[PDB]
A paper describes a structure:
Thus, lipid transfer proteins of the Ups/[name]-family shuttle phospholipids across the IMS in a phospholipid specific manner. The partner protein [name]/Mdm35 has an important role in [name] import and folding of the [name] domain as well modulating its membrane affinity. The Ups/[name] lipid transfer proteins are widely conserved in eukaryotes and can be classified into two subfamilies by sequence similarity (Ups1/[name] and Ups2/PRELID3).
A construct of [name] in which an unstructured region from residue 173 was omitted and Cys112 and 115 were substituted for serine residues facilitated the best soluble protein production (PRELID11–173) with no effect on activity. In contrast for PRELID11–173, the Ω loop and the C-terminal α3 helix are much more closed than PRELID3b. PRELID11–173 exhibits the most closed of all the structures while the structure of PRELID3b displays the most open entrance to the lipid binding cavity, and this likely contributes to its ability to readily accept the larger headgroup of PS. Mass spectrometry (MS) identified that a fatty acid, likely an endogenous E. coli lipid molecule, was bound to [name] and the abundant E. coli phospholipid phosphatidylglycerol (PG) was present in PRELID3b. While efficiently mediating the transfer of PA, [name] showed a low PS transfer activity, similar to Ups114. K58 points into the lipid binding cavity of the [name] domain and together with R25 make a specific electrostatic interaction with the negatively charged phosphomonoester of PA. K58 was notable in the PA release pathway as it maintained contact with the PA headgroup in the secondary site.
Numbering used by the authors:
A (entry chain C), D (entry chain A): 12 to 80
B (entry chain B): 12 to 184
C (entry chain F): 4 to 185
Write the structure that this text describes.
């Protein structure tokens, strides 16, 4: 019903950040409301986990320019 | 053309704001069993109110049997895919760039998509999709051919020097 | 002497011309005696595996050679299964003394998924001097890796199109799941 | 100073057949002489040994048209 993160320890943090991010996206972001990010704290907690999981699995995501080159 | 270029167009009979929201919620779905993992690995809002995201997917590696026999070292590994995106509500557009970051010697598939309000129907969303399929194996084939030709030319020299050797030896017994 | 090469169609084509300062009959005899020589240490084995004389007094022969497989290291890594195998080479020839010509056709019979080198040579009396022999040498260097590259590319495109269909059906599934709650 | 046969047991047979053939080639065949071939029984014995060795080593020489035609 929900996706897994690439780090198993990160999945439930993901499910809770996604769910918050979606509410902010539809209700503020797409409507132009410029009040700052609501899910900030959930995000860097989530990030801290996945970034470690990414290095642990040697997923080669570093040094890659955004939107390609 | 060593690189195969694809150009495509789609219409989603839903409004741009629904499609942009669905973008982030579309996994899992009954057509996504090959998508195993999903993560946001970067996300920010720019000063001009654009959302920048990088999403990491892991996907099953599904290869025809002939390519499994030819590329044994690739069979065991899932495919890792990055999707960069720019969501711009002010202009009702979203731009995405998606590509595999491993198996890259075997092949790279890159896709650039643009989502915008359907020009015929303000309640719908059109998708303009570009893709490039490339393989470093074309360069490997050329390197193998160049090596083959170099060795052949070197062996021609050895052949003729060998002929001269044996003829000199035979002329006078 | 001179030679050149250029592409045919992902096939490389070579054309070479050389001269031996020896008469055609000495060259034809030497053809059978040239191994071993100081320049042939990569040639390990030599055998006749077919030979006959035709009604029109031509000698048809098939010679089998084993040659050392010396690949660059980048190619060893790419082709681990080819490293342990010597190269087996067949040389077919027609010797025609009535017309003082010999024609040879030489090619590798293994390693053939990695590359094939085919050489067609014609030995004849040199047009300028009766005591010399000229050799017209053609060669084709091909690799089935080009067809593999195209097949990989075609499977990548087909899988991409299939994923686009799944992406769109997935969108349609979730839009309908979202438009049914508010 | 002489070549080995792909078949280890065949090399002396190969060498004896080769020089018989060299003499016939240079002195009879290349001069248009049609005294058949004096080396046929050397050749038949040599081929028996080497064709055997080619099968045991699975050298793939069968099914290949002469002169690639
Ligand atoms: C054998 C696997 C090698 C190449 C993997 C190709 C993955 C495609 C990356 C680009 C994906 C574009 C988005 C899509 O497929 O819907
Ligand atoms: C890695 C092995 C690839 C194929 C080996 C090439 C063998 C050459 C066959 C044709 C030989 C013509 C005579 C010559 O090369 O001097
Ligand atoms: Cl805390
Ligand atoms: Cl399944
Ligand atoms: Cl895929
Ligand atoms: Cl491999
Ligand atoms: Cl807006
Ligand atoms: Cl890989
Ligand atoms: Cl290379
Ligand atoms: Cl070389
Ligand atoms: Cl010989
Ligand atoms: Cl390969
Ligand atoms: Cl292999
Ligand atoms: Cl082989
Ligand atoms: Cl194929
Ligand atoms: Na299933
Ligand atoms: Na690998
Ligand atoms: Na607006």
């Amino acid at each position: 019903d929900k996706m897994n993160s690439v780090g198993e320890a990160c999945t439930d943090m993901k499910r809770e950040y996604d769910q918050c991010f979606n509410r902010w996206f539809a209700e503020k972001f797409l409507k132009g409301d410029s009040s700052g990010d609501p899910c900030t704290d959930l995000f860097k907690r989530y990030q801290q986990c996945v970034q470690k999981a990414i290095k642990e699995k040697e997923i080669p995501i570093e040094g890659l320019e955004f939107m390609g080159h | 053309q060593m690189v195969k270029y694809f150009l495509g167009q789609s219409v989603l009979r839903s409004s741009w704001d629904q499609v942009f929201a669905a973008f982030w919620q579309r996994y899992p779905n009954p057509y996504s069993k090959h998508v195993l993992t999903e993560d946001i690995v970067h996300r920010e809002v720019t000063p001009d109110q654009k959302l920048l995201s990088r999403r990491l997917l892991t996907k099953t590696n599904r290869m025809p049997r002939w390519a499994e026999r030819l590329f044994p070292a690739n069979v065991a590994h899932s495919v890792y895919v990055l999707e960069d995106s720019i969501v711009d509500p002010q202009n009702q557009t979203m731009t995405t760039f998606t590509w595999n970051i491993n198996h890259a010697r075997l092949m790279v598939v890159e896709e650039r998509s643009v989502y915008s309000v359907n020009s015929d129907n303000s309640g719908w969303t059109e998708i303009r999709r570009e893709a490039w399929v490339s393989s470093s194996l074309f360069g490997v084939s050329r390197a193998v051919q160049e090596f083959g030709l170099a060795r052949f030319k070197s062996n021609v020299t050895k052949t003729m020097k060998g002929f001269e050797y044996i003829l000199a030896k035979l002329q006078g017994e």
